[PDB]
Amino acid sequence: DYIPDSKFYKVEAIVRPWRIQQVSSALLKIGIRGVTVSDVRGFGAQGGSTERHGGSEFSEDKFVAKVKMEIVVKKDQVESVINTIIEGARTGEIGDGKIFVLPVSDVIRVRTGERGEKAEKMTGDM
Amino acid sequence: DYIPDSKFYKVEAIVRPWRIQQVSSALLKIGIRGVTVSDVRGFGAQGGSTERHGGSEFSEDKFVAKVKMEIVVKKDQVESVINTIIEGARTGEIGDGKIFVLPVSDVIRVRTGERGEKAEKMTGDM
Amino acid sequence: DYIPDSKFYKVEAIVRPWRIQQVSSALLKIGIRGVTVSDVRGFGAQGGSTERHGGSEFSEDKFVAKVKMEIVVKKDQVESVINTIIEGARTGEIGDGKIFVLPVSDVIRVRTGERGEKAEKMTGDM
Amino acid sequence: DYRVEILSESLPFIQKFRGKTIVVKYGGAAMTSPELKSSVVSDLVLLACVGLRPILVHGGGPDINRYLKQLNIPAEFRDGLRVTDATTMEIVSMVLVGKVNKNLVSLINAAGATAVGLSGHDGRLLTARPVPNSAQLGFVGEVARVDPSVLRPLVDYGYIPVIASVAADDSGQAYNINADTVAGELAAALGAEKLILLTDVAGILENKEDPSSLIKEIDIKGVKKMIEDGKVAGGMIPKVKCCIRSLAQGVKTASIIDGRRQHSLLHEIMSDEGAGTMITG
Amino acid sequence: SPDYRVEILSESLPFIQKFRGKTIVVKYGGAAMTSPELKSSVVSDLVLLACVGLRPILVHGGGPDINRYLKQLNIPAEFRDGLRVTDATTMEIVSMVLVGKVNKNLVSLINAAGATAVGLSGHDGRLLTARPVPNSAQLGFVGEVARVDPSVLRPLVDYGYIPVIASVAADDSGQAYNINADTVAGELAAALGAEKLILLTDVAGILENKEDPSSLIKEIDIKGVKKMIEDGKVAGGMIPKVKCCIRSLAQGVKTASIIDGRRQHSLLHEIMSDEGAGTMITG
Amino acid sequence: SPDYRVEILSESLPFIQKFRGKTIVVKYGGAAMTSPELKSSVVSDLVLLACVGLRPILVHGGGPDINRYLKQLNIPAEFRDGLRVTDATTMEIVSMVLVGKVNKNLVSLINAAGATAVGLSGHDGRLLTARPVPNSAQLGFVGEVARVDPSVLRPLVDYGYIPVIASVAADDSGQAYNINADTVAGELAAALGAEKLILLTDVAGILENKEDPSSLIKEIDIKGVKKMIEDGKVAGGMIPKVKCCIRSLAQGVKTASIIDGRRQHSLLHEIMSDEGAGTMITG
Amino acid sequence: DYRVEILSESLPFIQKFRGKTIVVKYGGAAMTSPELKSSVVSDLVLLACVGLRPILVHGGGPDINRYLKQLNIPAEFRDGLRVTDATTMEIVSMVLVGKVNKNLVSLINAAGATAVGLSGHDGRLLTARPVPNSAQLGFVGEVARVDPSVLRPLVDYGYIPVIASVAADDSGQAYNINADTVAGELAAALGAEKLILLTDVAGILENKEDPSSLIKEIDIKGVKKMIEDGKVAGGMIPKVKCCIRSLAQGVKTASIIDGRRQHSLLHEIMSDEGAGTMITG
Ligand SMILES: Nc1ncnc2c1ncn2[C@@H]1O[C@H](COP(=O)(O)OP(=O)(O)OP(=O)(O)O)[C@@H](O)[C@H]1O
Ligand SMILES: Nc1ncnc2c1ncn2[C@@H]1O[C@H](COP(=O)(O)OP(=O)(O)OP(=O)(O)O)[C@@H](O)[C@H]1O
Ligand SMILES: Nc1ncnc2c1ncn2[C@@H]1O[C@H](COP(=O)(O)OP(=O)(O)OP(=O)(O)O)[C@@H](O)[C@H]1O
Ligand SMILES: Nc1ncnc2c1ncn2[C@@H]1O[C@H](COP(=O)(O)OP(=O)(O)O)[C@@H](O)[C@H]1O
Ligand SMILES: Nc1ncnc2c1ncn2[C@@H]1O[C@H](COP(=O)(O)OP(=O)(O)O)[C@@H](O)[C@H]1O
Ligand SMILES: Nc1ncnc2c1ncn2[C@@H]1O[C@H](COP(=O)(O)OP(=O)(O)O)[C@@H](O)[C@H]1O
Ligand SMILES: Nc1ncnc2c1ncn2[C@@H]1O[C@H](COP(=O)(O)OP(=O)(O)O)[C@@H](O)[C@H]1O
Ligand SMILES: CC(=O)N[C@@H](CCC(=O)O)C(=O)O
Ligand SMILES: CC(=O)N[C@@H](CCC(=O)O)C(=O)O
Ligand SMILES: CC(=O)N[C@@H](CCC(=O)O)C(=O)O
Ligand SMILES: CC(=O)N[C@@H](CCC(=O)O)C(=O)O
Ligand SMILES: NC(=[NH2+])NCCC[C@H](N)C(=O)O
Ligand SMILES: NC(=[NH2+])NCCC[C@H](N)C(=O)O
Ligand SMILES: NC(=[NH2+])NCCC[C@H](N)C(=O)O
Ligand SMILES: NC(=[NH2+])NCCC[C@H](N)C(=O)O
Ligand SMILES: [Mg+2]
Ligand SMILES: [Mg+2]
Ligand SMILES: [Mg+2]
Ligand SMILES: [Mg+2]
Ligand SMILES: [Mg+2]
């Protein structure tokens, strides 16, 4: 089990910007219907590694454009989200992305006021 | 109680962009004096539902502009934040927003180095 | 210990935009090699306090440009990150920033599929 | 010399919405009366000259009905919406675009401004999709998307847009769209300050009967309760729903006003009282 | 074979680059719009010219479309030297058919063909200002072109929209006039300093003999066409057609052609080959 | 009644659209600035003209404001044919009063009225280059306009700022000169190809008789005003006032008016009505 | 021919800050001396011609004092700030804007460049609010906001801005603002590379007495400690505080330099040593 135990988790994926459409499409296929994205900058500088973006080289300190995906789901569907993101986003090149999993204590739909499981459920996911 | 127990929680609200001023104003009124917002894109596609933005229709996979609000507070004031956001942001239409609640283990003010409760407290909240 | 106990934590720092290069450089020096930043707006309105940005005054409700830094690390290196950010970002003026610490249940590298400690480790941090 | 001291007093009212977009739906008794018609035109032109950015959206029911009965294919309406087969659709587009649209454009051109008349087809301004009751209604459309691109340079050149409420789906089939709907969704697309609907009543009434119970100002939550409680009915329900729909999308105010009143448009914008009901977001 | 088709595409290169960036006014005559397949074929040719680097402006007519509605509504129709006698009732109908049916039909077809069109009448942006003809007592609300203001077309073309022009307009007092679509196309070509004016109609071109479709005159000058009018060889709707070529050529338009809109891809045959596809008039 | 007031607003339409987009140079005379209420009333009229689609440029004077400071500082004052005799000490004081008091007062009033102004002297952006007058030995540092460079005004007007112009400038060597505010307003109107020059002062307009405020000449031509100067009917500060109309009209400015700045909304009465509010001079 | 080999050697110094904005506050002994005055003007013009984007901000105390005593309303100062009632305010604006500002602008115009002189009123460049000690000081202001909009096209056209330190609040009341404050806050608004203050001392001294203990370079944390320890005092405390204030807002460097030195501005920018104290962010 995920060590801080919780009813919900947020899957936070920082990936290449041009892969967002494909990952979103694939997530939709397995019933993931709530997704948030935003433009970010980052670096993930392992060892001496050099990353390519816009035909240019980026080492250590130098920032590279990325997109952050945020998906909030029940504990049980967390693995499917991670795997779906990996398949959709992976190129095999340095700089493919990092995923984080964070505990979420509650979910609330603004329109209705539904809390918890009812708020997380989208009426078309199987 | 919120299941992962914590001294602080982050209230994360993804809402319509044109409602930010009103929610911020209302939060200020009940003593919420620290707020972070950023521009995001998202979809929340329930069932066959269609969402309206810019006079246009958005179904499933198609991204819609939103704003993400982040408010970090003590456990006890979490309910007041959620409720204040809902009242300020709700229109009654599809796409009104989702709120998430996440545990926060610590808060630190950069200027002073104050940790925990002292760092969370803003000298004008009653 | 950080009250919600976890193998990893996300250090989330909202600071002045012109300090990002210096904080990033200093973090790189102590072996912090994974960093995400994004443009945000915020207010931190203590008491009657007035904040200066772009030569102008900002009180309460009025939003000010900031940058959000996100660094995910092992529990033990959390203090070094916080301290390094504070030294790099502090001016001594109102509006220097807030730092939040959140539990992270897992880390995954997209390129390889490495989970947990292997995914968090960057081959050049001592 | 009283004419200029009045002009001077309207200064703060003129300044308030300078550079702001305003979407006006013209129909009803304001259409059928030549005197009211020239007042609307006047008011539009004045607003344009005074620094506002008005857009006129029209319907034109009575004119359509006349030609349909000339052709022995008389009108059929279900809950305020016209049953529109392929033959009716052709006549609808003929009247709305070829008669009404160009009539308004020429009247504006003669009033010392310059208008450009467009349908949803032009510059792909609108794309339609079949309405939920399309099985009964035929080629009646909802707005699937708005592309306001074409309006950008026209407004920059100082032309007044005049919009006819027909459009096509993506395959090229023409659809008949409710003008209130077009006005509301167009306002949402432009991030308009105001949506203004001209109707045949004083505004929104507390009691369906007496016109002295007119509500001046109310919010989304307010009128949504008025629908549920049954205090508002009939043809006024679709109007309010279009107002809510565009308000929810970021339009600041939506007004339902009395088209029967001379210069109602100017009254709505240039006075604190208004000319009907203002609904706020 | 695929190997042969591709080299034929590349053989069109010198023809594509010859009038690159040039304004061409294409008038699509009502008489040519005999089939839905031919309508979408003609807009295909027009769209192709835009994508290939030319600047086509579409003007259209709609005589037979109008005539059909006059029949249905029980209104008598009359023409004199190719111009419709237009009373007040007929004016209204002319405007509704041309702007509300034909214009939006063509705009709609262009939007479905991978381009975007904007449909305008003379009213719109004050593109055209009309004026009554001398013989108003006989013709009624038939107009001449008093002014062209091409201003509204500049931002539309700058944005990549193909304009589609209907031939009704008003005088300065706001009275509506019916202008023959040939006359409009010719004056618009002059206003835009167009390289070419090309008129699609329902015959091979100008015929020496109306009865004989093989008496096609392949090319002719201003002197020659003026003589055909005086000798009576040119009659009916071909008079305004021929007259709009004379007037636009005199105002600096380089060539004018009259061609068969019912022949498949005739617009392309006219521009993209040395033979052309009908009659070319030159100065 | 509210029903009547709104229709009166809409009655101003033809008057609003008549000079839409036209440049109007408005000179606000020192003698007219007799009250704080009248100062903010005049900027109200000026702001109204901008919001309504005209392009007003404000030039101002400040004779009485200067005179008050000369009195306080114990400096003798003298005028000859409406021009201030200006020694070195007086120049400094002229510049400080006109630029530092009056200019910023008006700029400040405009900013508080829902518009934004930018105040400039002839120095700024090299808007004006001065030159000594022939009778320097008598007048001292009194200048004529040698050059106008309107360049700095282009981006300011493009951004929607109302310029407010003070009438001091330097020659090319950097020596400061006092230029009469009428002269400046007239040469600026010529430089901008202005439709109108309108001068607000402390009398009804040009009077046939100085003593009799009912001898208002409602309109007059260049021949007529030249005669009034020669006959001595025009004297004192009215000489440069009348002369700046002659000079600007000769350079293509279409009309010039002299009106009473102390009458409420007189600027509006002059532009937005057939009668006007004083004297109009034409070519 | 030594003049051109020197010119050639200054190339890397000229290239370094090309396109960068530089905010220079002119006052003190650099004002009172005609020789130093023309050197500052020269230096400004050279910087502009060489590709930098300089902005000049001035005060002008001595000139104000002279007219105040001519008018029998002599100066009153509290902790370096002038007590400014309504009468004094009028004289302050008269001198700073009508004498000093236009003097500098004309000198620049005669030096072969072109200047535009502005106060805080012009284009609403500054909005003031009452200073914390306003009860004692009257119409003395802090900068409530900067709107740098008007400077954008002026700099694009190649004009040199020259700024007088008066402005109004939102109601239209004029305020007297400290020129150092205006320079610092203006630098913050423009995201300026540098803030440069001309003073009557060598820079920041380790010991208040001897001018040989001049600190070349120090950071925010460094000088903030120097204030607390009392190593810096008097009129130098407000100066350092304005430097910190703009540094904290993103200005890269802030220099306090010796205005008594010929060509001090050029020395500060065109040499590695500088002309006083550089404070870094
Ligand atoms: N520890 C971290 N904290 C915060 N953000 C991170 C972290 N690690 C990576 N990121 C974000 O993820 C982005 C892309 O992943 P990245 O390539 O850096 O991972 P990596 O561990 O270096 O794997 P790889 O060896 O495939 O490059 C970075 O640019 C950064 O924005
Ligand atoms: N499970 C989720 N994970 C991440 N982001 C989400 C999730 N659900 C919603 N969001 C964000 O919130 C936004 C708006 O809320 P949304 O309308 O999608 O909620 P909903 O559950 O569909 O409720 P409604 O039925 O009122 O539409 C989305 O566009 C998306 O950015
Ligand atoms: N409680 C909070 N929740 C979310 N975001 C916050 C919170 N507090 C501060 N922030 C973000 O951090 C930014 C800058 O820190 P800020 O100056 O507001 O902290 P502060 O507590 O007011 O300390 P100081 O007294 O130094 O100003 C804010 O503009 C806001 O974006
Ligand atoms: N509360 C109400 N206030 C005003 N009108 C109402 C209300 N309830 C029902 N109605 C009816 O709704 C109708 C809406 O006008 P409608 O005829 O649809 O306008 P149009 O013909 O211009 O589209 C009115 O004629 C009115 O009789
Ligand atoms: N010499 C001629 N050559 C060809 N066509 C002619 C000639 N004289 C008259 N016509 C007639 O002119 C018609 C074309 O004009 P018109 O009927 O107005 O069609 P359009 O819609 O193209 O204007 C032809 O169909 C033909 O009947
Ligand atoms: N014929 C005349 N008609 C009107 N005013 C005249 C005439 N001749 C001289 N004047 C004088 O000229 C004055 C206006 O000029 P001036 O005093 O310079 O005021 P301003 O500040 O408007 O320049 C009037 O107040 C009046 O005393
Ligand atoms: N450490 C220090 N270094 C330099 N000057 C100091 C220091 N401490 C105090 N001072 C004093 O602060 C004053 C600051 O100059 P000031 O007269 O305010 O300049 P200005 O008149 O140009 O505003 C100096 O005159 C100096 O005597
Ligand atoms: C569907 C429908 O009723 N469309 C309308 C358009 C006119 C209007 O909205 O005023 C119609 O009468 O046919
Ligand atoms: C005057 C006149 O002949 N108008 C034409 C216009 C249409 C066309 O030319 O095809 C008509 O038929 O009514
Ligand atoms: C030379 C001259 O007369 N200058 C004027 C300028 C001010 C004004 O015209 O009102 C003066 O009074 O000093
Ligand atoms: C408040 C205050 O002292 N303002 C100054 C402005 C001059 C300056 O800053 O140099 C003054 O002397 O009045
Ligand atoms: N209830 C109303 N009709 N209110 C109208 C408000 C009028 C105001 N001048 C505006 O247009 O915003
Ligand atoms: N008889 C003709 N139609 N000749 C057409 C000439 C063809 C040539 N490509 C052109 O447009 O210029
Ligand atoms: N005697 C006069 N002042 N006549 C003024 C004519 C008024 C007219 N509206 C104008 O400015 O052109
Ligand atoms: N302590 C100093 N004054 N240093 C000045 C540094 C000089 C350098 N050329 C610059 O302007 O950035
Ligand atoms: Mg990496
Ligand atoms: Mg949703
Ligand atoms: Mg704060
Ligand atoms: Mg014909
Ligand atoms: Mg005078």
CB-CB neighbours of D38 under 10 Å: 13
State the first-to-last Cα distance of chain D, in angstroms, to the nearest integer. 41
Q: Is the dihedral of CA F243, F246, F251, F257 positive or negative?
A: positive
What residues of chain C lie within 8 A of the CB of B103, using their CB?
Answer: 4, 102-103
CB F177 within 8 A of CB F141: yes
- Cα distance between residue A35 and residue A24, in whole Å: 8
Token look-up 């008549």 returns: F18
For residue D186, the chain B residues in CB contact (below 8 A) are 55
d(CA G158, CA G162): 13
- Tokens representing G149 are 């909009």
Where are the alpha helices (H) located in A1-126, listed in sequence order?
20-29, 78-89, 116-120
Going by the DSSP 8-state scheme, the letter that residue E213 receives in this structure is T
Which ligand does the CA of D83 lie closest to? 8
Give the C-alpha separation, C3 to D195, whole Å: 53
Closest by CA position to C65, among listed C98, C89, C43: C43
Q: Is D225 a catalytic residue?
A: no
Cα–Cα distance measured from residue F117 to residue F124, given in angstroms and rounded to the nearest whole number? 15
Per the DSSP assignment, residues forming a β-bridge with D60 are none
Pocket test for ligand 7, best of G199, G226, G243 (most atoms within 8 A of CB): G199
Nearest atom in ligand 11 to the alpha carbon of residue G65 is 12
Neighbours of chain D (3+ CB pairs under 8 A): B, E, F
Contact F200, F29 (CB under 8 A): yes
- Region of D92 please: left (phi>0), alpha (psi -120 to 50) or beta: alpha
CB neighbourhood size of A1 (10 A): 7
Q: What is the DSSP string of G27-62?
A: -THHHH-HHHHHHHHHHHHHHHHTT-EEEEEE--HH
The Cα C108–Cα D2 span in angstroms is 77
Roughly what angle, to the nearest 10 degrees, separates helices F104-111 and F36-51? 60
Residues β-bridged to residue F145: F130
Phi–psi pair at G103, nearest 5 degrees: -60, -55
Contact call for D146 and B52, based on CB within 8 A: no
Integer Cα distance of G57 and D277 in angstroms: 53
Q: Is D239 a catalytic residue?
A: yes
Strand pairing class (F196-201; F255-260): parallel
**In angstroms, what separates the C-alpha of B63 from chain C's closest C-alpha?**
19
Interface residues on F facing G, Cβ-Cβ cutoff 8 A: 72-73, 92, 95-101, 103-104, 107-109, 111-112, 116-121, 123-126, 151-152, 155-156, 158-159, 161, 168, 170, 172-174, 176
Name the neighbours of C, counting chains with at least 3 Cβ pairs within 8 A.
A, B, G
Would the annotation count G236 as a binding residue? yes
Resolution of this entry in Å?
2.5
Which two three-digit tokens encode residue C123?
Answer: 């081959």
- SS3 sequence of chain D: CHHHHHHHHCHHHHHHCCCCEEEEEECCHHHHCHHHHHHHHHHHHHHHHCCCEEEEEECCHHHHHHHHHHCCCCCCEECCEECECHHHHHHHHHHHHHHHHHHHHHHHHHCCCCEEEEECCHHHCEEEEECCCHHHHECEEEEEEECHHHHHHHHHCCCEEEEECEEECCCCCEEEECHHHHHHHHHHHHCCCEEEEEECCCCEECCCCCCCCEECEEEHHHHHHHHHCCCCCCCHHHHHHHHHHHHHCCCCEEEEEECCCCCHHHHHHHCCCCCEEEEEC
For domain D1-281, the CATH class is alpha beta
Place of tokens 């090699």: C33
Helix-, strand-, coil-residue percentages of chain A, each rounded to 5: 25, 40, 35
Cα–Cα distance, E154 to E120 (Å, whole number): 13
CA E62, CA G167: separation in Å to the nearest integer? 67
Rounded distance between C-alpha atoms, residue F150 and residue D217, angstroms? 50
Contact between residue D105 and residue D122 where contact means Cβ atoms under 8 Å apart: no
Torsion sign across C-alpha atoms F3, F8, F13, F14: positive
Residue E185's H or E segment, with its range, is helix E181-191
Q: How far apart are the C-alpha atoms of A12 and A15, rounded to whole Å?
A: 10
- C-alpha distances (whole Å) from C69 to each of A42, C52, D70, G154 are 9, 21, 71, 37
| N-to-C CA span, chain C | 23
Which residues, including other chains, have CB under 8 Å from residue F154's CB and lie 6 or more apart? none
- Look at C56 and G187 and tell me if their CB atoms are within 8 Å: no
Residue burial B52-64, b: 16+ Cβ < 10 Å; e: rest: bbbbbbbebeebb
Q: Are E86 and E133 in contact (CB under 8 A)?
A: no
**Cα–Cα nearest to A39, from B41, F179, C74:** B41
> C-alpha distances in angstroms, B30 versus A113, B21, B77?
20, 15, 10
D and C touch with 3+ CB pairs <8 Å, answer no
Please state the φ and ψ torsions of residue G90, each to the nearest 5 degrees: -60, -45
Instruction: Say what angle helices D2-9 and F36-51 make with each other, to 10 degrees.
Output: 80
Q: CA-based angle F68:F71:F72, to the nearest 5? A: 90
Query: Per-residue DSSP letters for G126-185?
Result: EEEEE-TTHHHHBSEEEEEEE-GGGHHHHHHTT-EEEEESEEE-TTS-EEEE-HHHHHHH
- Cβ count near G229 (within 10 Å): 8
Residue F280 labeled ligand binder: no
Residue A109's nearest CA partner among B24, B100, G103 is B100
Nearest 5°: phi and psi at D199? -125, -175
Any atom of ligand 15 within 6 Å of the Cβ of G90: no
CA separation for the pair D140, D145 (Å, rounded): 15
d(CA E31, CA E217): 20
- Burial environment of residue D35 by CB neighbours within 10 A (0 to 12, 13 to 18, 19 or more): exposed
DSSP state of E279: E
DSSP class of residue G100? I
CB atoms within 10 A of CB F51: 16
Task: Name residue, tokens 């220079």.
Answer: G24
Domain ranges of chain D: 1-281
Q: How far apart are CA E164 and CA E153, in angstroms?
A: 10
Which of D32, D63, D199 is the best mutation target for the ligand 4 pocket, counting ligand atoms within 8 Å of the beta carbon and taking the most? Answer: D199
Q: Please say whether the structural domain F1-283 has been given the CATH code 3.40.1160.10.
A: yes
C43 touches chain B (CB under 8 A): yes
Measured in whole angstroms, the distance separating CA G263 from the mean position of its chain's CA atoms is 16
Kindly report the nearest CA distance between residue A60 and chain C, in angstroms. Answer: 7
CA R_g for chain F? 18
Measured from the Cβ of residue E146, the count of other Cβ atoms closer than 10 Å reads 15
d(CA D49, CA F17): 7
Cα separation, F31 vs F65, in Å, equals 9
Pairing of strands G194-199, D166-168: unpaired
Distance CA E95, CA E69 (A): 12
D27, D43, D59, D61: the catalytic one is: D61
In chain B, DSSP finds a helix count (H) and a strand count (E) of: 3, 7
> Amino acid identity of D38?
S
HSE-CB of C117 using CA atoms within 13 angstroms: 3
> What do you get for the CA distance between the two ends of chain B, in Å?
23
- List domains and CATH numbers for chain B: 1-126 (3.30.70.120)
Quote the DSSP letter at residue E233.
-
Sheet holding E128-132, edge to edge: E143-148, E128-132, E168-170, E176-178
**Residue C49 near residue C87 (C-beta atoms within 8 A):** no
The D115-119 sheet, strands edge to edge: D115-119, D160-164, D53-58, D21-26, D194-199, D253-258, D276-280, D217-219
Between CA G197 and CA G63 the distance in angstroms is 20
Strands of the sheet with G276-280, listed across from one edge: G115-119, G160-164, G53-58, G21-26, G194-199, G253-258, G276-280, G217-219
3-state SS string for E71-98: HHCCCCCCEECCEECECHHHHHHHHHHH
DSSP, collapsed to helix, strand or coil, labels residue F18 as: helix
Rounded to the nearest 10 degrees, what angle do helices F2-10 and D2-9 cross at?
Answer: 100
Pairing of strands D160-164, G126-130: unpaired
CA pair distance G117, G104, nearest whole angstrom: 8
Residue G200: CB partners within 8 Å, gap ≥ 6? G28, G29, G258, G259, G260
